[PDB]
């Protein structure tokens, strides 16, 4: 899980039936493009309870291959066969950020950020399965260890990258804003 394989995109809620895109692997921050607002994920039971029992906060869940929302959201997006037409994204347009599954190589000229950033990783993780195809164990173990070390280095870099511009000290937040 790293930035270069992420992808932001607008969604079409349709107050419920909203479906999960095919490339969905893990969801990052989810919000709108109007004044800013961050959603929080909850369980199906919480939303079922909210439905009957009852709009600053907005929740959502995962019903199979859907993203449910308690409020009757009316997000709008251009239909499928639309030609170009960025559409100047209208209001109530939620923007989702998630980790998308990258494409599989199909041509020798096909490249990817992994090749330009860390080719030894792929080379070792594939020499693993190569030395498995043929009968060899020492090479398998060594290549696996090296690939795991490279992946650990990369994820540690990603970790040290996030929240890495200053320290933090919670300023005793006790909801100064209560009047509303």
């Amino acid at each position: 899980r790293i930035p270069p394989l992420e992808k932001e995109v607008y969604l079409d809620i349709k107050d419920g039936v909203a479906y999960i895109p095919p490339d969905y692997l893990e969801a990052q921050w989810m919000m709108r493009a109007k004044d800013g607002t961050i959603f929080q994920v909850t369980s199906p039971e919480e939303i079922s309870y909210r439905r009957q029992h009852g709009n600053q906060p907005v929740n959502f869940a995962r019903f199979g291959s859907r993203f449910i929302f308690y409020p009757s959201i009316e997000a709008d997006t251009p239909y499928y066969p639309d030609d170009g037409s960025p559409l100047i994204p209208a209001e109530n347009s939620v923007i989702l950020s998630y980790y998308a599954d990258p494409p599989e190589f199909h041509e020798d000229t096909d490249t990817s950020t992994i090749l330009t950033i860390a080719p030894e990783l792929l080379l070792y993780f594939t020499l693993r399965h190569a030395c498995l195809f043929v009968q060899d164990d020492n090479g398998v173990q060594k290549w696996s260890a090296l690939g795991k070390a490279i992946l650990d280095e990369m994820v540690e870099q990603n970790k040290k990258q996030e929240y890495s511009g200053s320290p933090i000290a919670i300023p005793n937040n006790m909801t100064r804003l209560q009047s509303s």
Partner: protein, 80 residues
């Protein structure tokens, strides 16, 4: 190019394609729109066709009347 930089690029995804349900919903929406248009504008066009057919029949009839009266009075004034 980036050497180890993670922000230096962003590899695309499989494909920015929706599920079959979204395509079905789009097809159903287009079909409902086209069907409403068909029905309403077809009733309107049928009513307009009837009205304009009767109107042009009356028009050609009264035109024959006007032309025969015109030539009648013309030859009547010519004879005087």
């Amino acid at each position: 190019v980036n050497n180890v930089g993670q922000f230096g690029a962003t590899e695309g995804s499989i494909g920015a394609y929706k599920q079959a349900a979204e395509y079905a919903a789009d097809s159903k929406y287009w079909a409902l729109l086209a069907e409403s248009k068909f029905g309403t504008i077809d009733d309107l066009i049928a009513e307009v066709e009837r009205l304009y057919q009767q109107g042009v029949l009356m028009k050609q009839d009264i035109e024959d009347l006007k032309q025969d009266f015109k030539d009648q009075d013309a030859r009547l004034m010519s004879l005087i």
